[PDB]
Amino acid sequence: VLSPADKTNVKAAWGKVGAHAGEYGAEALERMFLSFPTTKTYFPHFDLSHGSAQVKGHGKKVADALTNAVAHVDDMPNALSALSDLHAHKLRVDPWNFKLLSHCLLVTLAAHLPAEFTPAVHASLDKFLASVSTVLTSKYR
Template identity: 55%
Template sequence: MLAADEKRLILLTWNKTKTYFPHFDLRPDSKHIRWHGKKVVAALGDAVRHIDNISEALSALSNLHVYSLRVDPVNFKLLCHCFQVVLAVHLADKYTPQVHLAYDKFLAAVSAVLTKKYR
C-alpha cells in the first residue's frame, strides 16, 4: 500500500499533527476528538444563527485563537474544506452544487472572521 519513502515521511511528520492538541487521543472515535468536534460545530451553529453578523458572533472565538491559542490561520481554511467533505458525505444527493456554493461562501466568511485579527 505505502512505499517505504511514504511510510518514512508519515513517521517523521506524525508528531507534528499534535501541535495544537498534544494531549489529545487522535484515534478514530476518541473522546477528545468528539469533544472538540462538538465545540467546533457549536461555533458554526452560532455563526449560522447570527448569519447576518458572523463577525460579532465569532469575535470571542477569534480572539481566543489569535491571542491565546495562536493557531496558524491556514487551519481555518483546511477546517472549512473538511467540513464540506463531511456535508457532502452526510447530505449525499441533497448536497447540490447550489448548497455547496452557499456553504463555500458561508465557510469562507467564517474563515475570514477567524483570521481577520491576524493582520
C-alpha cells in the same frame, strides 16, 4: 460577501444537519488529522485516537460555534467575537489551516447530505466557511 440566497442555502443545509452537528464535527476533525497530518501539530495534548472523547467533545464545540454563526449569519463578527480573540491571542493557529478544516467539513457534509448537496449549496457552504474563517482570523494582527 454572502448573498441573501447564500444565507438561505446555508440555513437550509445546516438545518438538515440538525442534531448530528457534533457527530459531523468530530468526523470532520478526524478527516483533517488523517488527510493533512501537519494540522496535528496543534493538538499534541489530545488523544487523537479514533472515537476519542477529546475529539468527540471538540467536534461538538466546533459544530455549536458553526450553528451559532448560521443563526447570526448577518452579524458573524459580533457573534464569534470571543472565538476570534481566542484563536488570535491564545491558540495562534496559522490561517492556512482554516482552509484545510473547511474542506474537510465540506467533505463530511457531502457524505451525509446526498439530497441537499447541490452545486449551488456546495458553493454557498464554501463561501460560508470562508467567511467564518475570515472572521476567526481577523484579529491576528
